[PDB]
């Protein structure tokens, strides 16, 4: 008390010098580490008191004498002591001069706090395993995820301020360092948030960091992939197009764009263009592109209005399906879709053989059993189709289309009483599955 | 027999079935925690064997 | 047959704390051509009724190997069908058997605008549960309980030895490539079939494998990650691909 701070500074420097000298001569290491800890504490007191006096610039010894002690702990394996030291460092009053040190220690804590412990080895900061911020209105950390997310949020909030705005006039080192820091902090944020399944917050956070991105493939690709998971489509399609423009070498990006075009958005021309782009450029990717083009052609056939173009689209689709099957004989999806497309032309035995081959490839497909059961209807074999529908219901007692087919088939073979029983069962199931 | 429209009208309406879940959980517990374990292996082996039998049956019925 | 003497002397709290019991259990369980599988398996199940942790944690590390072995041999052959009983039992005890009520896992979302302990200028979210209890296994709910038990296994990563992680990554390598020409390049021999995995299963798989990178195992984790990302790209699953891509760009 009432002690000038330079005396504390010089005694801390002497402590650091002695600790350097103590180890370099042929336990006492614990005493040296305790001296390092007390030097760090007195340096923290020095900085806080000098800041208080100034408000009424060379940090050189605190960082070394404190970090290197728990660095030696990490070399030895004293994780708990280092975690406690980091916690007591971060819980102290903020210092404007050491904001970068706060950034660094927060990042170091966050990096290890997700890949170095387990759920039952976690403790709150308020109990054991100068001025300090306190109070009852503060948010007390509860689990590892909460405090890790808080640290990442505050680090991101402060790191946006210190951005150099990608100046690139003639120098590049500062922008490269800032970009690396932003990339690593956002990677930590996204890996922390992914495991819990909150994709809208992740998408918003990624959209927040789009100011830095000018010619970066990684950030745009991550944002585009995050957008699809949330559910939004149009923005996802536009960002996918931009990514395609950026680097035209991969095939997964146009495939995803074509899938989104084919999906609930119900667009056709863009899907055809993407399929043609895919087929323009191993063998699995081009087989998938052929399959997608055939699916698009088949979809366009249904929404026609006249005669000839329907047959033209059907023959193009069957040719594409045949090519896709020829290029790869070890995928059941292509065989199943070829059998489904072939059945439209009423050519029964060939479709039956193809669906039999598909069942040979995989005998547990839901749609394959339904197609096999429905094929027997055209051949006038009702009991066998009923048995197949029964087996499928045994596999999926919570489906709807199969039970609709069961009702339709029962109404034609046995009688209406079984149809009424199935209908009341479906009503009971619908009541059970909803509120 | 016959099925009436009132049967469906009462099927859609809830009949207060929020109480039997307790005894369902109790019977599951009585079957798992305290029932004998020797016959469980036999019954599950028989279930697997009948699953194989029905898979073979559907496989041979596919061709015909 | 040391386990035979162990069961002879077994059938009080200080029973556990053996030097080579884990090795013997791995030796007996590594193949399905054993004879005491059912007695020793229900004995392993008999270690779970007690409430202490030094027993559940001591017996929990054997799940991935038996899961792979039985769910690959069955997808081909005689099937015991009794391992499913133990899986359903652990699922039931972790979904219901805590005190009478079920489990509703939840947490909060920190808010920057609200002053906190470390800074000054939250709604409950459920990611699992409640899960209705299962009684039998079918091709519609099996992956759900498998993912749930994997999540249960992924809560005490510190305790198990390195051999458990090695077995886990070895299983993770060939499971997702078993039915593609890629495994022929890696020279894996065995069952030439495929398994229709789900998205959540591989999400928890990536969560589990991410810890193994900084615990010695380096090459196996890298090749497993490459296989996982290849399978995800072939299957067009957005979230696993995103997670794998994020992990890739964070290695020094």
Residue numbers in the entry:
A (entry chain D): 131 to 156, 167 to 196, 213 to 285, 310 to 461, 465 to 618
B (entry chain H): 724 to 787
C (entry chain E): 7 to 17, 24 to 29, 34 to 92, 95 to 139, 157 to 287
Task: Quote the study that presented this structure, word for word.
The lipid kinase phosphatidylinositol 4 kinase III α (PI4KIIIα/PI4KA) is a master regulator of the lipid composition and asymmetry of the plasma membrane. PI4KA primarily exists in cells as a complex with the regulatory proteins tetratricopeptide repeat domain 7 [TTC7 (two isoforms TTC7A and TTC7B)] and FAM126 (two isoforms FAM126A and FAM126B).
Here, we report a cryogenic electron microscopy structure of the C terminus of EFR3A bound to the PI4KA-TTC7B-FAM126A complex, with extensive validation using both hydrogen deuterium exchange mass spectrometry, and mutational analysis. Investigation into the molecular basis of how EFR3A regulates PI4KA required the production of a stable PI4KA-TTC7B-FAM126A complex. To address this problem, we subjected the complex to limited BS3 [bis(sulfosuccinimidyl)suberate] chemical cross-linking followed by size exclusion chromatography, with this complex eluting at a volume similar to the noncrosslinked complex. EFR3A C terminus was bound to both sides of the heterotrimer. Our cryo-EM structure revealed that EFR3A engages TTC7B and FAM126A in an extended interface composed of three α-helices from EFR3A oriented in a V, resulting in a buried surface area of ~1500 Å2. This interface is primarily hydrophobic, with the interface between EFR3A and TTC7B being ~800 Å2 and consisting of the first EFR3A α-helix (residues 728 to 735) and the latter half of the third EFR3A α-helix (761 to 785). The α1-helix in EFR3A is amphipathic, with the hydrophobic face primarily interacting with hydrophobic residues in three helices in TTC7B (residues 599 to 616, 690 to 707, and 712 to 723).
